[PDB]
From Swiss-Prot, chain B:
Gene3D superfamilies on file: Alpha-1-antitrypsin, domain 1 (2.30.39.10), Antithrombin, subunit I, domain 2 (3.30.497.10)
GO biological process, one term: retina development in camera-type eye
Keyword Mitochondrion: no
Protein name: Pigment epithelium-derived factor
Length: 26, 369, 25, 27
């Protein structure tokens, strides 16, 4: 028989890492 | 600027990797032998290096670079060194090798391990990480069960409970009970003296082959004679036998590398010899953590960068090795002479002929123990 | 006939957060 | 019948990261 369809979409990707800390204050 | 070609043996990739991992093995045996001036040293460092190189999968550049340097990978050129490692491991653990060698990465309980790291680890190294449970009695039993299964129950179970502050433990076990190419005749195995030093002596049971055939070489600068005995499955033990009766093996030990061992195997000459080898049966259960630290590997123990394993700040905390090793008269059959009597302190090395890998290494100051 | 294939891979990881705010003077 | 299908398509890019914390003080 014919090849089945492609599967469902993969899950959303992982959360971005937290940003770096700010510059030193004035 | 032009230079001679490298020995063709080391131009094969699996052999070039076997030599690199084996050279780490010789570095570790020197720190083990130097850290204990009496007793035997029995050591199968491949399972240790295997556990180290697998862990380097989840290591990010600056600390994978330190694992690569200690493993002699920085001299090797290879796009896919971890798949050559898979290749290497399938050679030396094949059934006719009679060698069982297993590595395991053990992690602190409740650690989420990125499967970006489990997947390669599993393709190249054939092992799965062990996430501890927190129950120390049952954690011990799981590893004693895993060693018992990977070594067909031929190593003893640890009585020791693993430490409370375990982040990353590395376990390498190995067992060898080989088969001589030419049997020893049991009927001529007798009890005879073994000289612990010039004064002290012990009687140990020594096998015998008074018209034996072997590859021989007297090394005049290291003051020892070297004989090579062949093992089933294309392996061999190379013995180092000093001329004087001395427990000082320091010049032999300072020279062991895979390239030195390989030139010996090239230049040994076939002779007839009066050969006596004692029976050998030994075990080791021990933590090699400190010997690794002064192997320029201490950074692995203080804020390492294993980000490809997990986002949790983890750290190498323990390296455990068990090993058991035996030989006896058993072999396949029956296939002026010189004296070769191993009735004094001697080094032996078990080498895989196909890859040149170091499979076991021993310092026998006493086959009584 | 034929059966549907496996779900695809998980997407790329998000962009990292921006650099935080400046400190106190 | 016939064979299983292809792997489905790759998921979307994940949520962006949270902003970093405030920087240090300075005289």
């Amino acid at each position: 028989g014919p090849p089945g369809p492609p599967g469902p979409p993969g899950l959303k990707g992982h959360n971005g890492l937290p940003g770096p800390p700010g510059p030193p204050g004035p | 600027e032009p230079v001679e070609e490298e020995d063709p043996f080391f131009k094969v990739p699996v052999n070039k990797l076997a030599a690199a991992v084996s050279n780490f093995g010789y570095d570790l045996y020197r720190l083990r032998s130097s850290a204990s001036p009496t007793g035997n040293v029995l050591l199968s460092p491949l399972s240790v290096a295997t556990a180290l190189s697998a862990l380097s999968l989840g290591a990010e550049h600056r600390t994978e670079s330190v694992i690569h340097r200690a493993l002699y990978y920085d001299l090797i050129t290879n796009p896919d060194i971890h798949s050559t490692y898979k290749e290497l491991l399938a050679s030396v653990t094949a059934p006719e090798k009679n060698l069982k060698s297993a590595s395991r990465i053990v992690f602190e309980r409740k650690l989420r391990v990125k499967s970006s790291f489990v997947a390669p680890l599993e393709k190249s190294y054939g092992t799965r990480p062990r996430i501890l449970t927190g129950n120390p009695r049952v954690d011990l039993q799981e590893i004693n069960n895993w060693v018992q299964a990977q070594m067909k129950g031929k190593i003893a179970r640890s009585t020791r409970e693993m430490p409370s502050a375990l982040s990353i433990l590395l376990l390498g076990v190995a067992y060898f009970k080989g088969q001589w190419v030419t049997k020893f005749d049991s009927r001529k195995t007798t009890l005879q003296d073994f000289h612990l030093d010039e004064d002290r002596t012990v009687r140990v049971p020594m096998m015998s082959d008074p018209k034996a055939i072997l590859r021989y070489g007297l090394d005049s600068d290291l003051n020892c004679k070297i004989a090579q005995l062949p093992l089933t499955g294309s392996m061999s033990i190379i013995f180092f036998l000093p001329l004087t009766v001395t427990q000082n093996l320091t010049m032999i030990e300072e020279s062991l590398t895979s390239e030195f061992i390989h030139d010996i195997d090239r230049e040994l000459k076939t002779i007839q010899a009066v050969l006596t080898v004692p029976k050998l049966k030994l075990s080791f259960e021990g933590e090699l953590t400190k010997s690794l630290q002064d192997m320029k590997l201490q950074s692995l123990f203080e804020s390492p960068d294993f980000s490809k394993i997990t986002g949790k700040p983890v750290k190498l905390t323990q390296v455990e090795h068990r090993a058991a090793f035996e030989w006896n008269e058993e072999g396949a059959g029956s296939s002026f002479p010189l004296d070769y009597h191993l009735n004094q302190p001697f080094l032996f090395v078990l080498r895989d002929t196909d890859t040149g890998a170091l499979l076991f290494i021993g310092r026998i100051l006493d086959p009584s123990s | 006939p034929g059966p549907p294939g496996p779900p695809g891979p998980k997407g790329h990881r998000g962009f990292s957060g921006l650099p935080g705010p400046p400190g106190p003077p």
